[PDB]
Amino acid sequence: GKKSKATKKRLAKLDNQNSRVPAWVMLKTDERNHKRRHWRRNDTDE
Amino acid sequence: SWDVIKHPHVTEKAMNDMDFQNKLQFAVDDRASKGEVADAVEEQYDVTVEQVNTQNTMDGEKKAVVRLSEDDDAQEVASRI
Amino acid sequence: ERVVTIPLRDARAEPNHKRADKAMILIREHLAKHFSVDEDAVRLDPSINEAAWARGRANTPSKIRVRAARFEEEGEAIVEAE
Amino acid sequence: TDLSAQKRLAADVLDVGKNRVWFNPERQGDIADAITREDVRELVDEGAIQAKDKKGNSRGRARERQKKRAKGHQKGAGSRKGKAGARQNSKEDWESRIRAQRTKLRELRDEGTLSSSQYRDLYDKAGGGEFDSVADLERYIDA
Amino acid sequence: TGAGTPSQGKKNTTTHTKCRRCGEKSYHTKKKVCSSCGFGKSAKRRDYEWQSKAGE
RNA sequence: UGUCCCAACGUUGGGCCCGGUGAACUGUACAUUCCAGUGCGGAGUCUGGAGACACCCAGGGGGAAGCGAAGACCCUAUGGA
RNA sequence: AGGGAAACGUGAUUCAACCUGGGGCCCAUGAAAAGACGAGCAUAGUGUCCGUACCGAGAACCGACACAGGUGUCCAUGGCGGCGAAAGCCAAGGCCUGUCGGGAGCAACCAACGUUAGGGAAUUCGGCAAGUUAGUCCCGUACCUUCGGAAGAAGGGAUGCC
RNA sequence: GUCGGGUGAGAACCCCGACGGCCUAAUGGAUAAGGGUUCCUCAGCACUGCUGAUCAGCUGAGGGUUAGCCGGUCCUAAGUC
RNA sequence: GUGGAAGUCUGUUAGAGUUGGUGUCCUACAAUACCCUCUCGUGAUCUAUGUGUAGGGGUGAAAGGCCCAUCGAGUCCGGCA
RNA sequence: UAUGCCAGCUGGUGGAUUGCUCGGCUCAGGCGCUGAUGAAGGACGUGCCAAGCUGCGAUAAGCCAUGGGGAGCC
Numbered sequence: 001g002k003k004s005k006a007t008k009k010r011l012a013k014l015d016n017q018n019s020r021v022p023a024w025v026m027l028k029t030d031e032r033n034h035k036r037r038h039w040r041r042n043d044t045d046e
Numbered sequence: 047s048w049d050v051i052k053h054p055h056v057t058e059k060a061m062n063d064m065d066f067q068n069k070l071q072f073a074v075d076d077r078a079s080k081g082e083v084a085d086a087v088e089e090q091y092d093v094t095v096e097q098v099n100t101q102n103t104m105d106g107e108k109k110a111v112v113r114l115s116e117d118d119d120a121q122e123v124a125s126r127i
Numbered sequence: 128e129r130v131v132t133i134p135l136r137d138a139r140a141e142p143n144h145k146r147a148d149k150a151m152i153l154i155r156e157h158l159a160k161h162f163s164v165d166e167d168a169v170r171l172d173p174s175i176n177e178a179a180w181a182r183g184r185a186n187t188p189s190k191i192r193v194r195a196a197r198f199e200e201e202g203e204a205i206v207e208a209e
Numbered sequence: 210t211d212l213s214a215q216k217r218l219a220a221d222v223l224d225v226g227k228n229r230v231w232f233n234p235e236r237q238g239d240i241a242d243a244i245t246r247e248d249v250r251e252l253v254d255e256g257a258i259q260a261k262d263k264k265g266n267s268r269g270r271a272r273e274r275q276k277k278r279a280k281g282h283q284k285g286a287g288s289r290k291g292k293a294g295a296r297q298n299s300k301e302d303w304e305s306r307i308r309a310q311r312t313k314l315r316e317l318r319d320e321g322t323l324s325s326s327q328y329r330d331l332y333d334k335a336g337g338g339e340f341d342s343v344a345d346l347e348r349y350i351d352a
Numbered sequence: 353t354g355a356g357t358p359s360q361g362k363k364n365t366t367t368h369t370k371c372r373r374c375g376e377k378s379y380h381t382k383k384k385v386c387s388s389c390g391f392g393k394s395a396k397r398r399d400y401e402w403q404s405k406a407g408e
Numbered sequence: 409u410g411u412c413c414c415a416a417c418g419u420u421g422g423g424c425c426c427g428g429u430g431a432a433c434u435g436u437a438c439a440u441u442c443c444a445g446u447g448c449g450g451a452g453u454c455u456g457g458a459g460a461c462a463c464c465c466a467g468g469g470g471g472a473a474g475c476g477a478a479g480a481c482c483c484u485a486u487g488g489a
Numbered sequence: 490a491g492g493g494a495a496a497c498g499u500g501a502u503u504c505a506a507c508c509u510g511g512g513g514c515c516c517a518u519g520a521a522a523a524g525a526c527g528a529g530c531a532u533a534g535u536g537u538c539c540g541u542a543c544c545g546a547g548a549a550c551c552g553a554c555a556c557a558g559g560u561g562u563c564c565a566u567g568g569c570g571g572c573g574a575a576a577g578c579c580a581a582g583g584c585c586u587g588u589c590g591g592g593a594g595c596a597a598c599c600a601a602c603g604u605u606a607g608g609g610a611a612u613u614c615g616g617c618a619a620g621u622u623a624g625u626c627c628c629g630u631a632c633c634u635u636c637g638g639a640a641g642a643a644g645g646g647a648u649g650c651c
Numbered sequence: 652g653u654c655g656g657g658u659g660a661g662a663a664c665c666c667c668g669a670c671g672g673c674c675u676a677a678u679g680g681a682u683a684a685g686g687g688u689u690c691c692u693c694a695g696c697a698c699u700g701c702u703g704a705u706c707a708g709c710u711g712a713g714g715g716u717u718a719g720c721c722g723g724u725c726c727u728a729a730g731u732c
Numbered sequence: 733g734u735g736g737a738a739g740u741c742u743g744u745u746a747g748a749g750u751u752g753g754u755g756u757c758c759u760a761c762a763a764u765a766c767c768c769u770c771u772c773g774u775g776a777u778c779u780a781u782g783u784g785u786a787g788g789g790g791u792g793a794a795a796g797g798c799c800c801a802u803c804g805a806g807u808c809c810g811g812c813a
Numbered sequence: 814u815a816u817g818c819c820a821g822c823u824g825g826u827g828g829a830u831u832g833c834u835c836g837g838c839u840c841a842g843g844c845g846c847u848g849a850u851g852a853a854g855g856a857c858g859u860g861c862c863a864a865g866c867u868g869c870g871a872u873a874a875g876c877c878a879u880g881g882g883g884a885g886c887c
């Protein structure tokens with residue numbers, strides 16, 4: 001398919017939200033990313 | 047008001063282009079045209095921009111490959127920052 | 128070391144399209160027994176392998192002359208075609 | 210060691226199918242360290258990496274057969290599979306024959322042997338399918 | 353041809369998409385109308401009383 | 409012409425044993441049963457007899473009116489379409 | 490110029506692509522618009538914006554799954570074969586991932602399947618299933634018929650290699 | 652698939668060689684839709700992978716898509732607003 | 733002889749269809765699958781994409797067929813406890 | 814006396830129970846419009862390292878003034 005500039009920006013963001021909670025945040029909060037999305041198992045919008 | 051240049055895109059590939067092709071890579075505002083990138087770059091580093099290639103990245107930002115003239119040296123312009 | 132003739136008649140008990148594999152195992156079990164060594168210790172030179180697969184996986188020869196040697200600190204046999 | 214990456218690079222550098230690239234079994238360690246395309250070309254120059262030869266089907270037996278058949282053999286009822294019209298296109302064959310016959314008559318006319326009226330007469334009869342071949346035509350011409 | 357699994361294979365058409373007005377993946381790109389907020393059909397926002405229990 | 413008389417032998421994948429992976433159906437309870445009887449007239453469980461040392465492997469499914477589905481037939485409802 | 494380790498060919502046939510014609514059919518008549526041509530040449534400047542990774546499927550798509558299902562286009566000119574874009578075999582290219590293995594002559598039983606003497610549909614609701622026949626050429630071909638057909642009727646012969 | 656070998660704490664299935672095979676309108680090559688980073692590199696094995704795994708479409712971190720002359724863009728179709 | 737017509741014939745060319753096996757499967761590979769067999773294959777043909785018709789309404793070479801696994805009146809929420 | 818039945822003991826599995834309450838439910842008093850000077854809502858951004866939430870808007874967890882507050886804060 002052919003994505004537009006806006007679509008691309010959104011896919012970009014979704015990929016970014018797909019990172020893990022940084023290690024330091026665990027220490028800083030004395031102790032999960034509920035928005036983890038696999039390209040195969042999950043489906044994005046649009 | 048938004049600025050054209052955001053910061054230098056420094057990666058292995060960016061280096062090869064700088065050492066081997068006299069090109070500097072930047073992360074620019076995606077509303078910026080090649081022309082605006084060319085100008086901005088010249089006014090900030092005092093060089094002559096010969097060509098500019100852009101790409102809207104999967105990081106959500108725009109990337110510009112700016113080639114300088116044989117008169118300017120990428121390796122040096124980049125070394126002062 | 129010595130020269131031995133291995134009978135591969137027992138490979139017919141295995142489904143035809145797979146003789147080669149079975150044959151290759153018989154050979155190993157034969158040298159292991161006749162040279163008093165563990166099947167783990169028998170090394171078959173590729174020559175033997177190629178000999179047994181010469182006519183494909185289903186057409187193995189009924190016998191095969193094999194030259195094997197015995198020795199070392201854990202006991203073993205190295206064998207090849209002849 | 211895992212040389213699959215190099216296999217992909219070698220295939221491209223050598224410009225050959227991955228399945229034809231050969232890696233010297235005694236130099237896995239060295240090829241393993243090959244990270245760049247340049248690293249590959251270098252190993253190639255040392256012959257550590259090579260390309261196997263692609264085969265081509267032998268046409269020897271084909272040529273012997275082609276000869277027998279051109280000589281007229283191996284084409285008996287037991288060797289034919291297609292219908293007659295399949296083995297030789299009847300319309301195509303008619304174009305062959307009728308063109309030959311018309312060329313023939315064409316030459317005899319310029320040559321002077323035939324008057325534009327005899328020619329015309331013969332021509333029409335040929336197009337009418339009166340002559341099986343040129344020979345048959347020539348024969349008829351001689352009364 | 354089964355109306356089930358075998359008929360699920362031809363489903364590669366895009367219809368509903370992220371809406372420019374409400375953000376829901378409900379903008380029907382073929383109709384140019386949002387099934388969620390009414391964008392493309394109504395200036396006013398799509399809403400009905402039946403979206404909740406009568407007395408609430 | 410193995411559809412049959414009338415079945416045989418063989419081939420391949422299973423099946424069987426071993427390593428690894430590892431569900432589901434179903435379960436009021438008890439339960440080694442069989443023959444008779446009785447009982448809401450179609451009982452592993454009541455009554456009388458008979459048989460019965462425990463556990464396990466493979467099998468083909470006689471019984472549990474086996475599992476699966478609040479009978480789609482029939483009637484009834486001041487039911488529906 | 491480039492490319493090739495090297496040689497770095499010449500002719501021919503059959504000829505996809507591509508080009509250009511002739512014929513036939515219609516109670517069927519087979520888009521439109523932008524644009525181009527018409528309408529020369531030098532030199533110079535400008536040519537921004539969006540897409541571009543990868544899969545494209547017996548693991549990247551839809552089907553809750555790394556699902557034996559479903560899912561469009563182009564490569565229809567690789568060799569032998571032959572009527573053939575058919576079978577079978579083989580290149581180029583891809584693959585051993587239609588992804589659990591080891592052992593028992595490996596029994597009973599089951600799935601697919603081969604062969605079965607004599608008989609030959611006795612089987613069965615029923616020839617279900619299986620089998621028979623088979624390509625090509627020559628000869629030859631009934632009733633009936635809307636004269637088109639029936640027809641590959643039927644039946645008989647031939648078939649390799651050198 | 653098999654025999655050797657490589658790496659590794661660990662190897663039937665990760666890699667190299669040989670031998671043996673499979674796919675020929677496809678199991679090859681290029682792509683539309685659709686997916687959306689699945690692409691490449693490095694480091695890993697608690698998860699996913701019909702067994703195992705040192706491998707991976709898995710986990711983590713980085714990197715990667717460059718156009719006057721390929722598409723879009725422009726035109727108009729059924730038709731839509 | 734030429735010509736090459738046909739809702740023409742043969743045909744697993746591609747492609748479309750789905751007769752029999754009442755085979756395999758039937759906690760499936762699969763909420764309609766697999767294999768063999770079989771029908772059509774220049775036309776009332778098959779197909780991709782775009783587009784139109786909407787629920788007592790469409791669409792229907794008519795089977796009460798089809799309108800997203802939903803049809804003798806789709807689906808969702810509401811009326812509604 | 815294997816396979817095993819019943820009850821308990823030690824350990825586990827499980828998360829009931831009791832205790833606890835940063836949340837709910839309901840009642841009451843007060844108050845009450847916003848938007849072309851572009852609202853409400855959404856999108857995407859924004860942190861040294863930043864995935865979620867909150868805040869904020871290219872001056873982006875913020876800038877200025879006055880008052881309060883106070884030796885801490887990010």
Ligand SMILES: *C(=O)[C@H](Cc1ccccc1)NC(=O)CCCCCN
Pocket residue numbers: 480481
């Ligand atoms: C008549 O004998 C009916 C026929 C029928 C009924 C409904 C649908 C189709 C045909 N047959 C039955 O009632 C059989 C009932 C089976 C009961 C089994 N426990």
Ligand SMILES: [Cl-]
Pocket residue numbers: 511
């Ligand atoms: Cl012509």
Ligand SMILES: [Cl-]
Pocket residue numbers: 722
């Ligand atoms: Cl494109």
Ligand SMILES: [Mg+2]
Pocket residue numbers: none
């Ligand atoms: Mg990433």
Ligand SMILES: [Mg+2]
Pocket residue numbers: 100101
């Ligand atoms: Mg671009």
Ligand SMILES: [Mg+2]
Pocket residue numbers: 299300
């Ligand atoms: Mg003709």
Ligand SMILES: [Mg+2]
Pocket residue numbers: 355
């Ligand atoms: Mg339906």
Ligand SMILES: [Mg+2]
Pocket residue numbers: none
């Ligand atoms: Mg008793």
Ligand SMILES: [Mg+2]
Pocket residue numbers: 478479
């Ligand atoms: Mg009932």
Ligand SMILES: [Mg+2]
Pocket residue numbers: none
């Ligand atoms: Mg009734």
Ligand SMILES: [Mg+2]
Pocket residue numbers: none
């Ligand atoms: Mg009524």
Ligand SMILES: [Mg+2]
Pocket residue numbers: none
């Ligand atoms: Mg690409």
Ligand SMILES: [Mg+2]
Pocket residue numbers: 548555
């Ligand atoms: Mg798979």
Ligand SMILES: [Mg+2]
Pocket residue numbers: none
């Ligand atoms: Mg017989």
Ligand SMILES: [Mg+2]
Pocket residue numbers: none
């Ligand atoms: Mg009879």
Ligand SMILES: [Mg+2]
Pocket residue numbers: none
């Ligand atoms: Mg009888």
